[PDB]
Amino acid sequence: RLPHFSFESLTNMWNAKKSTTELKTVLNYWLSRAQINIQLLRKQDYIARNIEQARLIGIDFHSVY
Amino acid sequence: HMDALLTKFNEDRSLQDENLSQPRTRVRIVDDNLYNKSNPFQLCYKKRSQYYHIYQYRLKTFRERVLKECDKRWDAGFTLNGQLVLKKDKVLDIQGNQPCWCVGSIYCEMKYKPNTYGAPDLTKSYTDKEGGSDEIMLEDESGRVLLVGDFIRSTPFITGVVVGILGMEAEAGTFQVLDICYPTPLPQNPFPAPIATCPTRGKIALVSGLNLNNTSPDRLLRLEILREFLMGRINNKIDDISLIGRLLICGNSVDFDIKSVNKDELMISLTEFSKFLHNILPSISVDIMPGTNDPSDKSLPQQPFHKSLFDKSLESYFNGSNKEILNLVTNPYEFSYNGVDVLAVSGKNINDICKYVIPSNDNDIEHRLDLMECTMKWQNIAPTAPDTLWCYPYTDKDPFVLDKWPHVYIVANQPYFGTRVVEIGGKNIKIISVPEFSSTGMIILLDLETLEAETVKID
Amino acid sequence: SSVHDSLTHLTLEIHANTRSDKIPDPAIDEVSMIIWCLEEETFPLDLDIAYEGIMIVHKASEDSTFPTKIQHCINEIPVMFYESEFEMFEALTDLVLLLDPDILSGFEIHNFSWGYIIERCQKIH
Amino acid sequence: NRWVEKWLRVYLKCYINLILFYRNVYPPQSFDYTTYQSFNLPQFVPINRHPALIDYIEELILDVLSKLTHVYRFSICIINKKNDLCIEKYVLDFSELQHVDKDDQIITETEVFDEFRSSLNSLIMHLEKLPKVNDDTITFEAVINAIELELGHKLDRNRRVDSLEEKAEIERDSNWVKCQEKIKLTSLVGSDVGPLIIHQFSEKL
Numbered sequence: 031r032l033p034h035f036s037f038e039s040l041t042n043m044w045n046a047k048k049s050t051t052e053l054k055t056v057l058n059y060w061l062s063r064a065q066i067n068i069q070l071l072r073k074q075d076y077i078a079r080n081i082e083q084a085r086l087i088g089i090d091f092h093s094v095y
Numbered sequence: 096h097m098d099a100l101l102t103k104f105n106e107d108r109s110l111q112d113e114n115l116s117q118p119r120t121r122v123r124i125v126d127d128n129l130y131n132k133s134n135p136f137q138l139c140y141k142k143r144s145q146y147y148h149i150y151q152y153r154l155k156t157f158r159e160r161v162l163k164e165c166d167k168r169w170d171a172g173f174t175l176n177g178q179l180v181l182k183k184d185k186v187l188d189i190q191g192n193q194p195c196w197c198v199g200s201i202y203c204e205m206k207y208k209p210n211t212y213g214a215p216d217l218t219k220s221y222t223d224k225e226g227g228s229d230e231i232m233l234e235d236e237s238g239r240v241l242l243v244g245d246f247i248r249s250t251p252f253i254t255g256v257v258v259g260i261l262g263m264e265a266e267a268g269t270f271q272v273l274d275i276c277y278p279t280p281l282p283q284n285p286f287p288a289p290i291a292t293c294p295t296r297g298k299i300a301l302v303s304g305l306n307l308n309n310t311s312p313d314r315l316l317r318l319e320i321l322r323e324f325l326m327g328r329i330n331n332k333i334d335d336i337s338l339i340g341r342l343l344i345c346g347n348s349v350d351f352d353i354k355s356v357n358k359d360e361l362m363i364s365l366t367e368f369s370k371f372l373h374n375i376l377p378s379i380s381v382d383i384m385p386g387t388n389d390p391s392d393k394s395l396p397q398q399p400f401h402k403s404l405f406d407k408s409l410e411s412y413f414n415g416s417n418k419e420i421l422n423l424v425t426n427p428y429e430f431s432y433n434g435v436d437v438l439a440v441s442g443k444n445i446n447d448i449c450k451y452v453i454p455s456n457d458n459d460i461e462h463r464l465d466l467m468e469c470t471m472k473w474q475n476i477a478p479t480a481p482d483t484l485w486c487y488p489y490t491d492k493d494p495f496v497l498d499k500w501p502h503v504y505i506v507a508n509q510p511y512f513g514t515r516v517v518e519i520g521g522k523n524i525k526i527i528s529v530p531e532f533s534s535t536g537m538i539i540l541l542d543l544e545t546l547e548a549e550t551v552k553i554d
Numbered sequence: 555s556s557v558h559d560s561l562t563h564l565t566l567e568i569h570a571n572t573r574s575d576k577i578p579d580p581a582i583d584e585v586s587m588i589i590w591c592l593e594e595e596t597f598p599l600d601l602d603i604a605y606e607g608i609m610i611v612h613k614a615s616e617d618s619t620f621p622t623k624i625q626h627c628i629n630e631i632p633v634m635f636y637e638s639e640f641e642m643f644e645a646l647t648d649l650v651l652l653l654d655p656d657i658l659s660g661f662e663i664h665n666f667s668w669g670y671i672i673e674r675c676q677k678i679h
Numbered sequence: 680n681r682w683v684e685k686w687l688r689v690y691l692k693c694y695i696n697l698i699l700f701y702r703n704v705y706p707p708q709s710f711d712y713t714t715y716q717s718f719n720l721p722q723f724v725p726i727n728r729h730p731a732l733i734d735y736i737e738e739l740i741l742d743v744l745s746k747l748t749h750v751y752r753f754s755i756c757i758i759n760k761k762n763d764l765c766i767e768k769y770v771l772d773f774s775e776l777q778h779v780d781k782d783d784q785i786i787t788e789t790e791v792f793d794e795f796r797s798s799l800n801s802l803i804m805h806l807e808k809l810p811k812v813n814d815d816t817i818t819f820e821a822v823i824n825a826i827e828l829e830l831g832h833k834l835d836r837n838r839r840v841d842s843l844e845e846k847a848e849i850e851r852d853s854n855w856v857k858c859q860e861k862i863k864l865t866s867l868v869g870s871d872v873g874p875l876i877i878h879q880f881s882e883k884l
Contacts, residue, residue, distance in 0.1 A: 031214045038574040044586070045571050047618045049236040050627050056569060057587065057628065061606060064565045064591035067661055071563065072594065076657070081560055091561065091657075186626060187619050232627075237619055239627040268626065309714040312723045360715035 032062060111333055122297035122340045124380075128431040129418045135493035136425040138398045142486045149482050149489050153475070154200065154236065156491070157257040158184075160278050160498075165196040165259055169276055180261075186238030190267040196259035196276070199235030201242075204228075204455035205254045205479075226454025231272075233260065244272035248458035251469050253448060255476035278474060280521030281499050285434040286546075296432070297340020298549070300541035303507040303529040304347020304389070304441070305371065307364050314350065314533055317553050319371055322538075325551075327378040338540055338549070342381035345507045345529065346426065346441025348389040348404065361390075366406045373409040376420060386426035387443035387508070394483035395444055395495035399423035427497065435543055438501035442508035442531075444477045445470055449509075452479060460511035464528055467506045468517065471524060474498055503527055503542055512537035514548045555595065563657035564592035564650075566668055580674045584639060586611040588646060592653065603653060609634035611642050640679050643671065682786065683777045684744050685718065686875065690795050691740045691753065691771070692716060693724045694802065694879075698755050698769055700725040701806035703814045705732070721795045739821060745851045748779045749828035756822040766817065768882035769802075770867070777874035785873065794870035798879055801868040805881060822858070831855060 043052035080094055165182050166172065172180045178193040189197060204226045210216065231242035252258060262270030305318045321329065326339055349364040372381055384399060391397045401423045402410060413421060430437045449463040470477050474496050482488040482495050503525045513528035525548060530537045536553030568585040570578035589608050597603045612620055614637055624633050636642040660667035700710050709727035714720045716733060743753055750773045757766040830852035840846060863883035870877045
């Protein structure tokens with residue numbers, strides 16, 4: 031489970047000289063979203079339903095989705 | 096047996112040569128603390144998201160506090176071959192190869208070895224290996240720097256510790272640890288000696304909290320059977336009564352767990368606490384404080400709960416006597432015997448650091464004894480949920496671990512007994528770690544004759 | 555792998571320094587810090603790849619210690635120091651010419667994504 | 680009244696579960712000495728928690744207290760697995776009760792708890808003073824020697840039932856069966872508080 035931050039709160043933790051920790055969390059938080067996006071589409075949409083369908087069918091990747 | 100023969104042998108004390116309808120009153124106790132001050136830790140009568148503003152308040156308050164001491168109380172810049180020790184805290188100019196006084200606060204490793212909606216154990220995989228490594232990071236809120244050296248593990252400056260570090264720089268990232276800084280001493284509250292007609296003053300920090308679940312009789316045992324009579328009927332013939340003063344519990348008034356308790360089992364243990372306290376109140380006056388597992392705010396400034404610890408027999412005494420024989424005091428309190436100021440802590444404030452939230456800073460009584468030495472020295476944020484109030488948490492007068500220093504700090508509920516004394520440049524401070532009562536008691540006399548403590552094994 | 559099967563994938567996400575009364579509007583607001591993530595064994599080379607990287611936009615006022623905070627406290631990558639926001643966008647496109655972005659990963663793929671900076675650079679830049 | 684059968688419920692909880700503890704019909708490591716099982720106990724009585732079993736015990740006590748004037752003598756019967764023969768018959772009494780009179784006076788909470796603590800400690804005393812051989816293979820069952828009862832026909836006569844209180848009451852008359860109706864008998868000190876005369880003895884085989 032990933033915590034979600036509102037964009038106004040993210041704006042509060044961006045843009046100004048507050049502490050190191052809020053820069054750390056906005057950076058590591060959007061990186062955590064990026065890494066779970068990579069793991070998530072690595073687990074379900076790429077391998078399980080799409081890419082072996084491309085190697086079986088023959089048509090390229092875009093029109094399958 | 097021959098145990099009875101020992102009583103047969105000891106016929107010298109027929110009645111101890113006491114009248115025994117004469118009570119020999121022992122203590123002329125002063126207790127200057129009770130009436131003519133506000134207690135800072137105590138609540139606000141008008142009062143009767145929070146933590147965030149408090150953390151910057153501690154950081155700024157310490158920042159001007161120790162800003163007065165980087166060259167006044169520490170190293171002259173004429174040394175180090177004129178390496179500049181000027182008061183630059185930010186890491187932008189720490190990268191200058193002259194070592195400055197890096198006034199910052201260590202937040203290197205503080206998370207939990209024991210524990211799922213938020214998926215904690217998957218996050219805790221990062222906790223275990225990285226936290227186990229003892230490496231220390233210093234944060235002035237402008238940037239982390241690496242720390243190595245001998246004092247990494249020997250001196251337990253775990254968290255919230257504003258220090259100025261001195262080492263040969265040799266890299267922008269890291270230092271060694273040769274020196275640390277401290278807050279300035281708020282000054283010597285005068286320790287008196289009443290030299291003319293010395294009272295042989297009372298000497299007590301006895302109870303760490305009579306931890307009393309209804310679920311066990313063994314914790315009920317060693318209270319009301321050996322105690323309440325060591326204060327008055329069980330006799331060291333007769334000097335134990337002369338040493339003993341006014342009763343001091345510290346936290347842990349009734350042990351219970353919050354998710355398993357209801358109304359009437361709370362009053363069962365509270366009325367048996369009332370039995371104990373109304374039993375001992377004719378003999379020895381008492382000062383009572385809640386704060387870890389007895390009912391509380393579960394904070395260091397915690398409102399002490401009157402009128403609930405007592406039955407109707409004992410309820411009318413606090414109405415009758417305002418603060419003399421018993422008063423409700425908080426988890427910290429400055430008990431002052433005309434300037435013998437002593438501080439109390441129920442123990443949770445250091446026990447969470449000592450067992451619950453510690454993956455690092457470890458080179459077990461002689462280790463954990465010095466954690467509250469550290470927490471005394473920096474006067475800092477020990478716990479994980481401090482000051483925990485919806486209205487008026489800290490109004491720039493009342494730090495939970497305060498700024499005025501005592502002569503003895505009381506902390507409680509350790510595995511073993513520990514009692515040393517250390518002298519600092521400000522004052523002298525005796526270390527008091529009174530153990531939890533199910534861990535064999537080790538119940539203690541405190542102070543105030545030649546500033547000396549005496550434990551006794553209650554098991 | 556021994557042969558590259560298909561479709562190395564890298565995401566792109568943003569920060570919004572929005573007006574704090576309203577939802578972020580990319581026709582109004584910018585992005586200072588860009589986060590792309592490729593981490594798998596599908597890409598063979600693994601020199602600077604299968605390895606996350608983040609880059610900045612700042613106004614060249616280094617005195618507010620934004621670069622030095624990130625590089626010392628956080629040890630992910632040497633963080634690229636970019637300015638002049640269109641040039642940072644250009645260096646992002648240079649990076650996706652360097653790498654192999656076959657699948658263009660993301661989330662809210664018209665709104666909080668590649669498409670955010672595409673119509674942002676269409677209307678503002 | 681209301682408070683007096685609460686005291687009877689706690690006293691029978693202590694009596695029953697203490698007989699269960701000292702006969703080792705349940706393992707002693709499940710028992711722990713305590714004061715709170717849903718109420719305030721007079722003594723620290725070893726109670727295993729086991730919520731099916733404590734549900735059974737407060738069930739049986741709420742069954743016995745439901746009649747409250749037919750019963751002149753509650754008792755506990757002890758039966759082996761080996762034979763149905765009575766090993767012990769612990770005597771209790773509901774004689775000259777306050778509740779039948781419904782007298783408001785007198786509460787005497789500390790005094791009634793004092794005499795209850797006395798009768799409990801007597802039960803402790805004459806439950807250690809018989810020895811421990813064949814400490815397993817013992818069971819439990821109830822018996823009531825009552826002066827004037829029969830309720831078990833209330834299941835019959837084509838009754839139509841609508842409320843949960845009398846659902847409970849039909850469970851009370853359903854759970855109780857009249858049996859068909861000496862070797863040794865030992866003395867026990869009973870409580871002799873005024874409104875609650877509990878003249879409690881013991882029987883052996």
